[PDB]
Symmetry: C3
Subunit: 233 residues, 3 copies
């Protein structure tokens, strides 16, 4: 009942540091992607970590460099570390809800991003056909983390786009586009390492289940009890 | 050593308390974006209240009536969301939380920015007089209680600051007293005093800060600094 | 560590808790800063600063209470509200604050922090008669902060507030349509009543969106730290 108190405090302070460290991975991730810097992004990942993009997984430093570098950086900046003249890709990061597992060796986190993106008139000659010149996009992250040798790293980065808009017309006017199945790397040089089982896009919606327990009611939370209090109108 | 331990334990409790109160607001946001009124109501103390457009919605009943009977019916036709073509993302940010000296209540300032709308696929279901797609921002100055060791929302006070049709923007935007529940099926339980009534954008009104000046505290006096400012 | 003394363990916990409180206090200065500037309240802003602190605006420094009152009061408050503490009818200047990455120095007495803002700004049609010529009626703007902090007598204060605008847009036309405007060097106060106390070197002059320039990260790589080397990862990237 002094050793017990110290050990219990040490655990509590470790969890507070764990939360800060995991939130920092996401906030840093954002500052690196805004500048199309895939190297810093890949270094955030456990070597067996993955990024989920278009219903596949891009695995390890190779997969992360392929997605953010071979695909995105070539597409957006012509294969230059950013930022560069006339290219905006700000993915503002916010609203972290992080859950450390009981053993303190893994964690989950919900986050979200809002992207303001575009090719300025000065560089729109370099914009790929079929991309809007300036756009908004938002999505939800439900990510996994691992603590390796005392350091938190990204184990799974799963960004689920919720909506997109052309700046000029807004989210209400976006045309649905049917998403074909990806071909994997290596046959597809920018493809995923592997496919997920069985997402079509805005205006279609699908819940992203919360990784976090109800913060007041926890496992006792029952929807139906509360639904009884609502009426038709 | 007992004095030192107890003082450390208190400091760690306050750090946990700040995280727990911020979590209520961030979770609140993820639930409201999905028109999930049950999860929202469960965040509240049983004697909690929501202040919306100068009325109070009291307890689980008031909270279910505001977010369920009114908003969920309005936006999704009375379905837990998210649903096809309906956007109601209220991004939550910029927490400044003050735990009371006794550690049993707290205040927090927060803010939200809402991207909202009916996609062309579902605008047939949009009520008349609502814009198809809009931005809105507002400020929260909330109250919290720690009940049986658990932080809960005591008073959620959201004050809308501006709204814009997506197409025209906030500069180009163009309000009766509420009728209470139950005569108004979606009304508040009670009205705020006229003195606390807010008119909307372009009309503005300060939302006083719940937090002390973070550097000067009680010593902060505006007039001392105003002396240094000139006309231009 | 079951082999460490209880004293060493206590002291090490006390240091750890102090660092966690330091991070919260520094983030609070930026979040509070934002709520004060959104209301055009220069006095509360000035009080956040060390007395020898500065704000970097357009390649100059505004130094101490005087400089901070001059930038936010004499210049900005006069420009936006006609010299009234806000908020006021029809005037929007919301600079949403987010995405803190804060690094406390080893000695615990200084700190750096990266942050960013996104501004939704404008004059409502009701007050646009009072808008200065050459300013858009409604606009977006975003910028990056790389700030310095000092802990004075156990209180964290802003030592250097360095806001670097990254982009701006007229609401109607968007960031892709913004016209580059060549930015002349500032004239200092006092010859310029709203000017900086001193200029930064030409080498620190920034031209504006669509021109871009990195704002180096104040933080180490959060996983690899000083071991992070770009070239090792660049080897894994191919042409496409
Ligand atoms: C009180 O809690 C909140 C309420 C809001 C509403 O302003 C939003 C979304 O419910 C709204 C926007 C446009 C409307 O026409 C509308 O009509 C009822 C409601 C936003 C944030 C809150 O926390």
């Amino acid at each position: 009942s002094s050793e017990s108190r110290l050990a219990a405090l040490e655990a509590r302070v470790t969890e507070l540091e764990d939360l800060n460290a995991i939130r920092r991975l996401q906030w840093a991730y954002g500052y690196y992607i805004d500048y199309n810097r895939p190297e810093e992004v890949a270094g955030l990942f456990a070597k067996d970590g993955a990024v989920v993009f278009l219903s596949g997984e891009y695995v390890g430093y190779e997969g992360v460099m392929r997605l953010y570098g071979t695909w995105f950086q070539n597409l957006f900046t012509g294969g230059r570390r950013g930022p560069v003249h006339g290219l905006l890709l700000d993915q503002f990061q916010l609203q972290d809800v992080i859950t450390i597992a009981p053993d303190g060796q893994t964690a989950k986190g919900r986050f979200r991003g809002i992207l303001a993106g575009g090719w300025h008139d000065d560089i729109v000659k370099d914009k790929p056909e079929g991309m809007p010149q300036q756009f908004w996009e938002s999505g939800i992250y439900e990510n996994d983390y691992v603590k390796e040798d005392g350091v938190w790293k990204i184990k799974r980065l799963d960004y689920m786009m919720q909506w997109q808009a052309d700046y000029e017309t807004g989210w209400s006017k976006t045309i649905a586009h049917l998403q074909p199945a990806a071909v994997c790397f290596p046959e597809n040089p920018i493809g995923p390492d592997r496919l997920l089982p069985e997402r079509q896009t805005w205006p279609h919606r699908a819940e992203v289940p919360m990784s976090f327990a109800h913060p007041v009611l926890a496992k006792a939370f029952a929807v139906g009890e509360f639904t009884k209090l609502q009426k038709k109108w």
